[PDB]
Amino acid sequence: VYSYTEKKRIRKDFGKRPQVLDVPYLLSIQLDSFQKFIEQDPEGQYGLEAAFRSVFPIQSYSGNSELQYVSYRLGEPVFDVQECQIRGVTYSAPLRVKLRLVIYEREAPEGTVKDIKEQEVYMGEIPLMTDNGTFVINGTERVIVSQLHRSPGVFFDSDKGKTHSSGKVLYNARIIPYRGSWLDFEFDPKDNLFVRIDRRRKLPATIILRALNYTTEQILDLFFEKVIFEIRDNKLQMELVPERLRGETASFDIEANGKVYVEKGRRITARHIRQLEKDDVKLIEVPVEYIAGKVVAKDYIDESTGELICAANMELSLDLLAKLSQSGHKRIETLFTNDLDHGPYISETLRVDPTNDRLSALVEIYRMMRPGEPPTREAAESLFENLFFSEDRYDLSAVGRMKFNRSLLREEIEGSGILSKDDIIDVMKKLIDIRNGKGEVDDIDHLGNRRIRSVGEMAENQFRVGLVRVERAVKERLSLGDLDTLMPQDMINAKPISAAVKEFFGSSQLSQFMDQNNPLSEITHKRRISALGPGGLTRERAGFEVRDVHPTHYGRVCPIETPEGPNIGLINSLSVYAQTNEYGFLETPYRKVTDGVVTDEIHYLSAIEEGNYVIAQANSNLDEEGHFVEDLVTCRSKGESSLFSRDQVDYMDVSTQQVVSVGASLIPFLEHDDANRALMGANMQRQAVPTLRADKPLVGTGMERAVAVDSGVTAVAKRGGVVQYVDASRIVIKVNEDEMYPGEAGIDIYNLTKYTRSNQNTCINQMPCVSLGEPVERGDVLADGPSTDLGELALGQNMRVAFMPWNGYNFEDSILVSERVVQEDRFTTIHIQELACVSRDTKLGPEEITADIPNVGEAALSKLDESGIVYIGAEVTGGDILVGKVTPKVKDSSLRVPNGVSGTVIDVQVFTRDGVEKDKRALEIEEMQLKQAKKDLSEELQILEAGLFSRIRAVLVAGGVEAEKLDKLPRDRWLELGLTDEEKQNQLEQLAEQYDELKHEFEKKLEAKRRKITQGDDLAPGVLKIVKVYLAVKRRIQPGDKMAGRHGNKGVISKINPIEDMPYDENGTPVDIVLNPLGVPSRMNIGQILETHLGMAAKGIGDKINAMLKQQQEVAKLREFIQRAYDLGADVRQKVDLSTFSDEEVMRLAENLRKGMPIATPVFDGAKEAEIKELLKLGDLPTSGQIRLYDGRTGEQFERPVTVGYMYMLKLNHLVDDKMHARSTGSYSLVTQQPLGGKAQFGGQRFGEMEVWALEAYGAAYTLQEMLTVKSDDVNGRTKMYKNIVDGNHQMEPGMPESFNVLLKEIRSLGINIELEDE
Template sequence: MKQHSLEFNMTKFLVLFFFNNMFFIFYKFLFFFPDFLNVQRKSFRNFIKNDFIFEFSKIKKIVNSKKLNLKFLYENFKFLSPIFNIEESILLSKTYCSNFYIPVISQINRLKYIFNYFSNSTELKWILVGTLPLLTRRGHFIINGTIRIVINQILRSPGLYVYKERRKNENTKRLYYADLISQRGAWLRVEIDKDKKLWLSTKSESRIPFFEFLKNIGFKQKFIIEYFSIDLIDIKTKKKKSLKNNKFLYQTFFNPLTYSLGFIGRKRLNNKFDLLISPKVLKLTPLDFLAIGDYLIQLTNNLGSFDDIDHLKNRRIRTIGDLILNQFQQGLIRFRNLVFGKQIKKNKKINLNNLLDFQPINSAFRELFVGSQLSQFLDQTNPLAELTHKRRFSALGSGGVNRETAGFEIRGIHPTHYGRICPIETPEGHNAGLVNSITMTTQINDDGFLETPYRLIYKSQIQDHKNPLFLTAEYEESRLIVLSDIPVCKFKFLKNKNLPILFNQDFQKFKVKEINFISVSSLQYISLATALIPFIEHDDANRALMGSNMQRQAIPLISLEQPLITTYAAKCLLQNSKVIPICKRSGFIIYSSNKKISCYSFLNFYKFQCRNSFLIKIFLNKSINFRKKNYSNIKTTLKKKKTILKIEI
């Protein structure tokens, strides 16, 4: 009876608490700041589950001169548990990694000269493909006993970018050119001169007549004249030079093994020119060149628009998973070329372990984690320095910009950075503006573009009961957005009739009924280190930059004191740093220290402990009274128990 009455009282308490605080629960805690280390974990998890299998599916079968036939059963790959755990890897100066295996079916064809027939020998064996360093729970790697991280990289997204040539003499006709950037492969440029002649060029090749190149890739001369409305004289060029260069370009840009636009590059090309090419076709097609030439000719008639390279819709983030995937692709290409060069002797016994040498994959991983500019030693001065180092991204590195030649346009603040990249926190010196931090609420979508949250506004009322929407910079351009610090009435209606609105990268005044979105919080425009500064709106921007950088240099104290003035970001920092014990269940705190937290949970009626040890012995012999205002007293008595909880850290 006592147990049933206790359960009834607890249920009554929870129901009353829920209905009396419904407004507080649904409206105040609907949006939480995301996990600050989710960027690393999400990208690394996506690489292991999806990208790893997809890359092996490209080379699922290799045939070597009709003698060696290899088939990879890539869907059955297996990762083994690490030999050393995290603590042992640091103490023994080892790498915290995992070996991954894949089953391979090999079929070798030999010609028997005595009996004059073919004999096939088939073998199935698990082969060690390579060793992959693993990401820890705190978002870093352990390489040879040292803690390292791979920071994210921001660079131009694959696709086509159209520019206007800057000329000193304004009386001359303007020249336009289009740069085609790929995910893997050579760089290509198509340009038009003042006589409306199109040229195609690369870094290694000189200018080639564009119309002659179209003829060599399959278009007829009559079709080119009718499509571009040009004369026959414009097509006649020197054939020897153009044919030689076009043969080189055909092997370079139409070969899927050496050139790839990527899914993002193909998607952007289709959207820009309204093409219906399949997203699975990652190489260039003749229709792409036809659309590029037509777009450049339309620019001479004042039709079309130019691209802003600093706009965040044209720049994407290469996360840890993308960087590891890039190295894995290079390793697989080297391995494939190595297998093609293997020679099989007539009567010698074949050993698959000696034949399939996956050392190029391990060397490709080593180039990233040891020799890359993006792989750095983790800054462990304090928890803030550790967390901000992991949320940083750089424009340097392979495929990025050069620090010596980078100008003010790349280093400056673009209007699309608003809500996505912190305008304050950046290093001082040569890396100023090239190394930045993402804001507190920024997320990275599957394509690598930055998103920031907004709440929907319907008929000048804020829709707090709906989840916030994460918008990219491209989608945000055509929307009317208002800041969150405007006056709002009790029923969430906007008070003022005319408000300053962010529209088309500028602040303008619009009527309330035309507004589409409102920002979630005033903290979504600055980074974590900047949000720790109290009353930052009263500081000069240069002083705030110094303050955000100097906080990372503070040494932790032995005897701690609670600050008199703090911000909400301090709580988020402690929760996401993973350096203190955190109770993952709600309830009443019985005991807490810097090593463990004892919590009594209402919902599950059991003692929950969180402690940094492998085995915990708990002895309970207490009577606990809970009292809530306006509710009946709830008295529970815990009998003597002896329990052992085993917690895996």
């Protein structure tokens, strides 16, 4: 079954894997993000509501005045997208909020309200999504890429001993908040723990440990295990457990109850541990010398003397034993201190702590944060508190809290926005465990530690920053309290927030200039992920690890689609089925497999969980009942793919396409190409140029319809129905009675843009592709966009290619092109350029634009009107004049044609400031625009009152007035006909009551349009009026273009050759493109050969259809033939029966197939060779696909048959005239007197320093000297040579490089004396 829109041309596809989850909306990542930014959220956890709740309410210092938020809404936009684009204004909506002012009496208990005031307050203008999902700032279209950054949380990184000579592994811990100051912990080579804040100087860790009101004893208790000693008769005994007997050497014999358990002198043994735990003995005597290395755990003082005998963190000795024994300290507490299990790293830091009172510690912290400041103790306390406990100056956000809890094996995933002492303690414990081997470090490249930050979060953060600024300002204002003197609107200033938002959208690292030169590039640019920008790596700081692809990248980011050059691996695009999680993590679809059955159940899995299950392969053979046909299948668990049984499998990929992006997806037969050339081909396909007439590619992917529909460049049928009126610019659709609205249903209107400038000087055109009186349904395709055909993507053309060397015209990589190609204009494109003229108000009279120009011939004015504007449709050439703008001296500063470019004028636009007289040409363009608008409006009227007067006539029929009179009587006369019949009069009189309302609202809306058109356009300050001119140029293929294929086999056109000299087959059909086969084995991208062979298969059917169509044979024999073609293949999912199709439909499909049957191919479920050969057998072509040829030059038969076929060839955006230029003599830089750079400035090339060394390497001296002195900067000398060349003498003059003197003065500008010497 199919809808009518695709019944025009059904494209056959191969593939055996049934589809379970179709491609979703390609833009759901972007639009649905910004969607979550504007609606009213009762939860108060998204967008504006969440931002406001974090700032409101605000209290005064006195506490008597308060400001609260109530509600907010978005005002309607002033214009639409088209008007904003035309007028160069930001498509935005006003922000409406309701504010609350509360006053509390100073002489009343807290909470006593003095007065209340509610008032709507203007906030500013916020830009809104286009229906396509873009931005408009100044008549231009910009898009916001989605930033990918390090997920807030905790990481444990290892330097692998790179910075140390011995290579000892160091482990460092980093905690990164969502917003605030950072924090780091490290191990020195000396095996000690240190802390640092904000990438500053290393500091001992324990400084902060006691900063939280921790005594040394508490720290030691937390960080170590206690060992207890009991003083028996001149002896000490210790309570021993077997578990604590790890990695120890028995210095003395271990024995209890008089029986020897462990020998003396050698290392411990496991069997001794087993026998000791079997005996279950705890207390054992210990020699005194065995304790010569034990550090006391706690403090010990004498009750009598009152002096400290020995505090914690000091080594004990026999004399200390004597004091503790004589003081009655029978129980001795020590640390376990097992270097192989629990290293005494903390104690070593305790031995180097400068202080312990925590007050000098706070002083040291204060000095650390800001050097050279008074050590004020309360200031230090405040700095610490608002640096690591501030609710506002520090935050971890919800996602950071969840990551922190998960990393530290915590259960609850919800917490506050600040840290805690227990958190830091646990971080230290885990770091110690990592040092001791417990646990394992994490990976930075793992997607479980990175997240995507969409445009919504960017807008939220910028708006929050602006709100913080404005609330600080209003807090300062309200500090000067008043007795309700002011109205709650004056104390707020919208300028900071508005400026911040507008500047972030306009000029920012992420607000890239979008390039809609063709739908595919637009889509792939919208779905691009960048690691640059704020809170991310830079172009240079990036290392070799981030650029690399990670084993967890599967299904989430395309491994083969990314720009190549100075930034590789950072601009990787999102995959097809990828979608964002609520927290902001990437997840992919999967199918649950139970009992060896693959059901249709779909789950979304994030990165981390992917390491806990078993994942199958997309192209895994399956039965009809979900059972793997064989018990041994290929699956991956953790970065590794190995065989597994049919029962261990849990999840399987939904489809094959979920590994590449759309750009890679459009590459046909990708599964037989190298990654490098696949990447090159995808990137080049991104840079395609619209064709004059679109043609469907013969070999496709299958998602071309999806990519064409999802991109907002082709008008889509919003509602089903039938076509009523057709036009090259407008489309009228009458809805069906099923989809009609209960009130004022009417019809629908679509306006098609015609030749509108793109963002890279390419032609944007919309093509109506439907006939009159044919039904349409919801979601169909009505108007073909640029590079689009019948709702199918169509970038380039399909040419007859033949891989064969030919007289060296394709020596290395070039392409030979027959003039037949340029005969049909199949590659000629349209380029649209802008020339703008600005009239400001300077001195010596304001800039005046008029046809009056002095010292100019009549030829220049011949293409000018009385108002000084070129007529529409003139054939302007280079060096001419377009608009005459002059300024009294009279100074002629009029705009002229750019040098070297010709074209034809298309449209002229004039902008005038408000309160400024509009000249005659402005009046004319205004009046034609108003006439067009009113004609369109009156057309919609005519239809609407057609409906309502049909209703009026129907009403009058039942009322008593005969139907014949209604037809005879005037149409408008129906309303005034006598209302004698009361029962029908109740509505007959009302009919006029709504007709008058409808006409009045039409009148007022028409007046609104008229006043909008007559409204003086806003301009930059000091600018009176500006004029704009559109130029349009046709570009045809000339030797030197950048023309490429779809598999990275780029190249340059060599020379146009007359068609009679091209090779031709026995049938006399010439081949128009001759590639170079030698580039195949080196590139080893064998896929294009298969593409060509399949191309032959397409037209092998194509000609036959043309055969019957020429012979006008019977439908029946035709109908089965197309039926036979579709049925070809092995277990093909797609099957179509033409029996249900009517004769007219069959004929239309056949005639639409005259150019060949399109063939689709899934990227990884592609067709193999057997069916290709079988399809070629259906045609009359040889199975090997290698037919003989004849040379036109010689007329003989080539000894070895060669391969020919159609291949999809593309023209890139690189024209020779865009690059071909040269400079003889022109302007000069005012500073260095050197020639400029850039084609637009008519500047010459740059004498590269590389080739300065290269020239110096040879014996060449005079040429180098000339290049350096005469043609560079010697203004005193180069003039003489210019005169000298005229006389014919090619004599030079040494001179002295002028730019060298400049440097002298620069050095003279310092306290450095430099000067030349004598002769």
